[PDB]
């Protein structure tokens, strides 16, 4: 029980890539993430601010996880992660009126392990412009969910499809959406 | 179907009544399975799975690690909340309410914080039965939306009113549907 | 500057 719940330290390291993820979360919303490849602090606050954060903290803390991971892999007889079945839902940020700017939201829920392909398909064609997704945000069951955004112009002739790919799926799942 | 091994670490802070009652819980996780946990109410490390049994004992044998985590509820939790008070905790975006028939749906979209209260009124009287509410929807970009619907029988010129209240509003928003 | 919690190594 609490009024707020923050996660000042969501650290991630999987042996797949190998890849990782460092994010700060407040009330289930991502404040910033550290690009572990580019060594940079990429803020997500929808405000103006002069806060700062050395990405070497993330690089060091995640490097401690890589060390601890190799040990727990040996102590567990190589007990690997179980590929969970993701849950996808496509909806709009605002009520759809035709001809006026809107944003499509693709919400993949219950993701584990954190490896996924999220691509938008307009009439069966890969969409590249105006698309952006979030980081892997932490769930309470220690799984993850991701969210992709596609700003578009809703008209009566463009059908859309969010295509998700995961190891828990034996088939690339497509989610439909019509204006 | 390739194999993958995951390790997580969550440094979580729980705030109640500002910084009056603050609780730190650091969780070490191996493939969704919490193995170790340092609870600030406990004061020391505690194993959550058989895996973390030698780790919680090894960490508790170190005196400085005990002090670095015991002071974390102030070094990490309380220090960051004072930054929260000057940014996120002052963020108030106003809801955009919309009525659309199908059954009448009320689309309250793009509001923050999550606290909100909507009600359905038929000719001034609050309609209770025949009202379905969806759970709150996280848009992921620091905004929420909620859909609340009223099963209805529209006769004559009955006026229907979606009445919402939100911390960003000093007076509530009411949209009508004749 | 926000602060973040740290992880410590386990016995190798």
């Amino acid at each position: 029980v609490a009024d707020h719940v923050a996660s000042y330290g969501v650290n991630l390291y999987q042996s797949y890539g190998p890849s990782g993820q460092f994010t700060h979360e407040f009330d289930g919303d991502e404040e910033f993430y550290v690009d572990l490849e580019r060594k940079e602090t990429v803020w997500k606050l929808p405000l103006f601010h002069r806060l700062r954060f050395d990405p070497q903290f993330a690089l060091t803390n995640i490097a401690v996880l890589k060390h601890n991971l190799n040990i727990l892999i040996k102590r567990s007889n190589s007990t690997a992660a179980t590929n969970e079945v993701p849950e996808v839902t496509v909806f709009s940020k605002s009520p759809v009126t035709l001809g006026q700017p809107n944003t499509l939201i693709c919400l993949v829920d219950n993701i584990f392990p954190p490896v996924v392909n999220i691509t938008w398909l307009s009439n069966g064609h890969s969409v590249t412009e105006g698309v952006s997704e979030t980081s892997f945000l932490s769930k309470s069951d220690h799984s993850f969910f991701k969210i992709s955004y596609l700003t578009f112009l809703p008209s009566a002739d463009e059908i859309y499809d969010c295509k998700v790919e995961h190891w828990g799926l034996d088939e690339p799942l497509l989610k439909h959406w019509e204006p | 179907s390739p194999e993958d091994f995951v390790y997580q670490f969550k440094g979580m802070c729980y705030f109640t009544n500002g910084t009056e009652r603050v609780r730190l819980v650091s969780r070490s996780i191996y493939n969704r399975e919490e193995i170790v946990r340092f609870d600030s109410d406990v004061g020391e490390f505690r194993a959550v799975t058989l895996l973390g049994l030698p780790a919680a004992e090894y960490w508790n044998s170190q005196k400085d690690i005990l002090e670095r985590k015991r002071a974390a509820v102030d070094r990490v939790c309380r220090h960051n909340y004072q930054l929260e008070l000057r940014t996120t905790l002052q963020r108030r975006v106003e809801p955009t309410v919309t009525i659309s028939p199908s059954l009448l749906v009320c689309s309250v979209t793009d509001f923050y914080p999550a606290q909100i209260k909507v009600r359905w009124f038929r000719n001034g009287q609050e309609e209770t039965a025949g009202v379905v509410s969806t759970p709150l929807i996280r848009n992921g970009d620091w905004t929420f939306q909620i859909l609340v619907m009223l099963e209805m029988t529209p006769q004559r010129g009955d006026v229907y009113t979606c009445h919402v209240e939100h911390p960003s509003l000093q007076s509530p928003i009411t949209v009508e549907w004749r | 500057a926000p602060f973040s919690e740290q992880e410590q190594p386990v016995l190798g």
Partner: T-cell receptor
Amino acid sequence: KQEVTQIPAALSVPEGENLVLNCSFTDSAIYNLQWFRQDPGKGLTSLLLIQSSQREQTSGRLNASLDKSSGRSTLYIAASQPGDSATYLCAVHTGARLMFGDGTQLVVKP
Amino acid sequence: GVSQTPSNKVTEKGKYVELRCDPISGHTALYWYRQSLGQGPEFLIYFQGTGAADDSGLPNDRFFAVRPEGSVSTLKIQRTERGDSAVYLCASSHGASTDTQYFGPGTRLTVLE
């Protein structure tokens, strides 16, 4: 940025004296304040470790203060012996690395 | 007891040197520092096991460190320089980068012209 400074660069004092060595760090966003002593053939040995949320740290004859809003930490050594004659280094921690001062040469004369 | 070899080292403006550090048994975190005359130590590198977690203190591509087994570390300095003359210190830790670090004696490197 961050620069730690130690004010008594050299200190030569008789036995049994109570003396004062202080540290000075510019930026206060620190995770730790630590005091060491360096001896010629053996390197540094830890003396104290103050957390961010603490103002006091008492241990033996050593007494350290911590004002992080004013970027100053002070070490008070009581009943100084010739045995604790060393260079006393003040180190602050910026979360990522350890930021060391320039040192204080202490010589307690018999 | 963390030990470093050799105790002293003297070279010229263009030779190759190596510094050895034996950490305390059981410490998976290892550090390299460098201290010049009248100054405090400077952070150089930080190994978390066999891999380096922080190498931002390394001043050149001429500087390289390696800890191939999670214990003994070797600090390699190629094409040495007069400005590389210092006392290089080594440390070890049981905890994170913020916990207590136990230092060794150091290696007095003096690179001559």
